Amino acid sequence: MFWDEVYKGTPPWDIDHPQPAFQALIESGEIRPGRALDIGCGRGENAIMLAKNGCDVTGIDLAKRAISDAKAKAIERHVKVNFIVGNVLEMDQLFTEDEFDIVIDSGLFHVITDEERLLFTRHVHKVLKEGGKYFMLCFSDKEPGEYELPRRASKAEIESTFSPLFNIIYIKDVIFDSLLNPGRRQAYLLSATK
Numbered sequence: 001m002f003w004d005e006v007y008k009g010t011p012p013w014d015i016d017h018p019q020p021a022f023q024a025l026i027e028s029g030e031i032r033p034g035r036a037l038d039i040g041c042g043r044g045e046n047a048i049m050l051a052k053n054g055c056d057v058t059g060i061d062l063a064k065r066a067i068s069d070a071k072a073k074a075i076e077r078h079v080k081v082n083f084i085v086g087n088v089l090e091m092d093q094l095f096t097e098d099e100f101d102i103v104i105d106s107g108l109f110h111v112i113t114d115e116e117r118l119l120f121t122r123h124v125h126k127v128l129k130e131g132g133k134y135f136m137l138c139f140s141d142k143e144p145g146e147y148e149l150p151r152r153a154s155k156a157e158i159e160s161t162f163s164p165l166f167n168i169i170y171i172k173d174v175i176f177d178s179l180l181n182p183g184r185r186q187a188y189l190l191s192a193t194k
């Protein structure tokens with residue numbers, strides 16, 4: 001399918017290190033040891049980073065190629081991570097309620113379609129523990145109107161999407177590392193709690 005196609009090679013988000021915004025959450029004390037889920041984990045850089053910093057990590061992604069490459073990376077780097085092929089819009093059949101202390105989202109929200117957004121928020125909300133944290137990284141949208149392609153998320157769009165089920169702690173300007181020529185893209189980091 002679609003996501004197997006993009007992993008026939010190295011897509012622009014598929015950097016060889018964890019995203020700096022998530023590394024900084026470790027440095028700032030915001031990500032503390034617990035059970036963590038990386039939704040749309042790709043080839044596993046952020047998930048492995050969380051695992052090397054005291055978390056029990058599960059990563060879920062639609063693309064078997066990404067999951068297979070993520071697993072091999074964890075094996076190479078002597079780290080234990082639970083990498084599984086799966087659909088975040090169906091993960092109620094994979095995880096029970098109130099399971100994860102942390103959910104990280106590095107570019108998944110960015111690709112979730114409008115008609116799947118409410119369902120997406122509900123599934124993320126369901127698998128998080130009481131008091132659980134959701135950290136989401138996306139490209140920032142500060143331009144009036146919605147002509148920009150690919151989509152980018154404004155603070156209003158983020159607030160409108162995640163306020164119904166989450167308490168928003170902050171939406172911070174950050175950088176998103178990319179393989180494309182402006183290798184640093186303006187981005188938002190949402191910190192939210194269940």
Ligand SMILES: Nc1ncnc2c1ncn2[C@@H]1O[C@H](CSCC[C@H](N)C(=O)O)[C@@H](O)[C@H]1O
Binds near residue numbers: 003013061087
């Ligand atoms: N419904 C869904 N369920 C699980 N994964 C999904 C999904 N829709 C898209 N994805 C995955 O979400 C990822 C977005 S690209 C981001 C990959 C990784 N988080 C990184 O930072 O490198 C892709 O790997 C894609 O296969």
Ligand SMILES: [Ca+2]
Binds near residue numbers: 141143145147154
């Ligand atoms: Ca806009």
Ligand SMILES: [Ca+2]
Binds near residue numbers: 141153
């Ligand atoms: Ca937008």
Ligand SMILES: [Cl-]
Binds near residue numbers: 017018019020
């Ligand atoms: Cl990093």
Ligand SMILES: [Cl-]
Binds near residue numbers: 087
């Ligand atoms: Cl599916």
Ligand SMILES: [Cl-]
Binds near residue numbers: 090
């Ligand atoms: Cl279903």
Ligand SMILES: [Cl-]
Binds near residue numbers: 096099
């Ligand atoms: Cl479970």
Ligand SMILES: [Cl-]
Binds near residue numbers: 115
């Ligand atoms: Cl629907």
Ligand SMILES: [Cl-]
Binds near residue numbers: 145147
């Ligand atoms: Cl418009």
Ligand SMILES: [Cl-]
Binds near residue numbers: 177183
């Ligand atoms: Cl880079």
Ligand SMILES: [Cl-]
Binds near residue numbers: 165194
């Ligand atoms: Cl709640």
